[PDB]
Amino acid sequence: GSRTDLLNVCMDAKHHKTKPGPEDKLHDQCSPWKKNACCTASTSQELHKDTSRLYNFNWDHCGKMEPACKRHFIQDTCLYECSPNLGPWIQQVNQSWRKERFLDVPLCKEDCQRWWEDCHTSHTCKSNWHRGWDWTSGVNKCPAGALCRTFESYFPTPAALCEGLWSHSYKVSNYSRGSGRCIQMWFDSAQGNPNEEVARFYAAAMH
Template structure:
């Protein structure tokens, strides 16, 4: 993404751009997206996140802050013209306000990166949705969310006792990785 041009349809509103910067930080750096990592066979990557439950307030604010900015596509994962070395709108794609391509918060959060995120019905602090924004001094609320979904996914994918055993090892593994 280092060559990705957020301003492909003119200057993006600073508040809107902040959401994309935060999204990139979450995607690139969060240790809590493990339950949603999927293997893919694409030339530019081998794995991706899929259907991460994004807290409804974070999605709503992202949409609100981007409404006055412009874009030319509803799916930013693919279809760009990269001939100049950075993304440009494909031939025939017109620049419109975000709300043209993303009429609802769900359309933005779920569509912009090919369903990397899923709009959650849960609120920030519920322990059931990933928060894009939080104060690290107050701890990382996404740790609880990742544990919850890892447990739920492992319980559904393997015998219950094994799933619980593996989940009980997560804190020890985190301590080991941090030391």
Template sequence: MAWQMTQLLLLALVAAAWGAQVPRTPRARTDLLNVCMDAKHHKAEPGPEDSLHEQCSPWRKNACCSVNTSIEAHKDISYLYRFNWDHCGKMEPACKRHFIQDTCLYECSPNLGPWIREVNQRWRKERVLGVPLCKEDCQSWWEDCRTSYTCKSNWHKGWNWTSGYNQCPVKAACHRFDFYFPTPAALCNEIWSHSYKEIGSSETGMAWKITPLLCLLVCVAAVGAARPGTQLLNVCMNARYHKEKPGPEDKLHGQCSPWKKNACCFVNTSIEAHKDISSLYRFDWDHCGKMEPACKRHFIQDTCLYECSPNLGPWIREVWAPAPQTGASAEDSPLADPPPATCRDTPGILV
């Protein structure tokens, strides 16, 4: 598909940058991750749809769309909205694929809750607003569509519908996409009246490249009911160095800084996360000789995620293990070693 799913950890990594800034919604928080919009073709509740069509198929385990809706999403001037993608001549197939994916996301995802807003429209009672898209995805959409043609920069309204499908309004000239959408951000943000919002890669602040933010919307369906809804998106683990509740920590250190607006870690924890054999767990990254700095950076990022993110709720589980005591043996450590192994290059380790 045009927007590929890559890392389920996307929720935990990226939500830190905007988790405390998601606009308020009239919905109860229990509805954030497993809810369907009150709109024209959406099911009342999400559920399995094993035969969803092509680009809509990633939602088959838990979908807000029916099979028929997924089929129609792939058609030109379908019965869904009678929308003609080819209103200024034939749209390039690579471009149309993005719009099909956009339709599948809108119709099928049960995880748009944080961005659902009430609207007073004849054909729907709810819409999405400000769903974040990664800069790379907006760039790809724009690049694939820039040589196709359109006559409007806002596709939500202002069309001529007298023929039963959308046509360009009088005096609206057809130009290339990059005339009406001069930048990728303009395309993502404006085409559907700010249903989407481009966020730059720098906003994630991560050593791990995150692609794309839509992974949250697509993948989390499988774990949406993992914990009580009130604890899904703003909760700290009950673990060794975590705060009781997330909150601002303006001076978080280095790679932990993306969580500064809403963190489960203290400043001192973030500093220790960057040290060798730190006070956190006394773990030696160089246990088989000097670890390459580029490699160590990933482990620091891993530690920051674990200690600081307030958005790991869907994956938090209770464990039953005695806390390590003063003078305890190595086997009692929270990072106890497995049975003895021989140090060797990472590529040779079977996982």
């Protein structure tokens, strides 16, 4: 094989398409991926719906999450579901309907900082959202022992948030947005998808 085999691929998990392709009808925040996506239109619709049971996650576990904060979580979800440029960060986990996950996606420090700043006023009860919720109500709720606190209590720094939230799905890069060496969670599609060249950078040959 070749390192370029990790370019333009979709991870093997849950909703993902088998291979990347255009999706003219991606919804709202996911539309920047419309030219080449690993998500379907339906997935993009459902992830925007706070009460969806097709895409079930309760962002309002500690009262209503501020829109300025929630938008980042939606954006994170669009990148996760739709990106065809995260091949270099795929890791095998081999769970039911979830063969792969992401490991250490090098999120631009500016995207991490802004996410954290915008979520400073909001509340949560957990520093790792990937496991441990009480799901007996039908949606995730704060489990025993987990008190609602300011985001800053559970995530003292932006790195704590981006790296901790989904068990190291991101690793903060100190490169700048548009360096071509860190993944942007937020980008407009006007001038193409800037993460294509980022994947190519990390896929370049050894030595």
